[model samples]
Target: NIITVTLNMERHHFLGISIVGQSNDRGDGGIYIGSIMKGGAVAADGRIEPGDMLLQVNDVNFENMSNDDAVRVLREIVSQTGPISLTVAK
Candidate 1:
């Protein structure tokens, strides 16, 4: 059973994060966080964890997106970033 949660943070210069499970590939059904660059963007909060699954960015769904597609959108969002919406799961 997947329990959903919401997390929002100040946009940083990279998010220091990697992701997995985007397209019709991978061992999972949804987009999930892969690795965290220790001294990178997410280092500030130290709040984002390894298994936190990604659900949205800027209110746009990433449910069935491709890895390339998702990451690109993330880049755009971050560069021109704001107090964007980020949905995650446990």
Candidate 2:
């Protein structure tokens, strides 16, 4: 199971983060936070960390999602004018 965290971001920028999907000979999937930008939204929050696996955004599951698709979900969440809910597995 994943842990859900709702982040109420002040601004809707990049969220100051990068992500990668787990890959193999089969395909690429399972989003993971690769890094957090310095002095950025996520870094300022001081809650999320690198290596944390992203499981969902809002109510959308990220399991087996492509890297591009995962980013799209993140952008969609940020575009909203409310809290961004992220479900992750540490």
Candidate 3:
């Protein structure tokens, strides 16, 4: 099985990173758009704020697939970029 967490820290100003502040399911709560790094480009770049989860990657929605499946598909993208795209929702 493929295992790896491919998270990008760089974020553009137009990019948004805010928590919905609600729960779709009682199990998982922390969900939103964009990602925040303590001391990375997004933080230093002042584009994304802290406590933000990545909502989308390269225009692909990350709110439909499970965390495990998300990681799996993302790992696939790393090696294959010309195939179909996958979207995951929390």
Each model's lDDT comes to 0.64, 0.74, 0.40
lDDT of 1 by residue, 18-63 (tens): 7776455472376678888866555555556787887777677776
- Best candidate, TM-score: 2
Between prediction 2 and prediction 3, which has the larger TM-score? Answer: 2
Model 1 misplaced regions, further than 4 Å: 1-11, 22-28
Candidate 3: where are CA atoms >4 Å away? 1-39, 74-90
Error of 2 at 51 (Å): 0.6
What clash pairs does model 3 have? 34-55, 62-88, 63-88, 63-89, 63-90, 64-88, 64-89, 65-88, 65-89
Give Cα distance to truth, residue 68, candidate 2, Å: 2.5
Per-residue lDDT over 3-87 for candidate 3, one digit per residue giving the tens place of the 0 to 100 score: 1123343332222233343356552443443455354423444433444454455455555555545445545544443422212
Better of 2 and 3 by lDDT: 2
Ranking by TM-score: 2, 1, 3
TM-score of each prediction: 0.63, 0.76, 0.36
Which portions of model 2 show Cα errors greater than 4 Å?
A: none
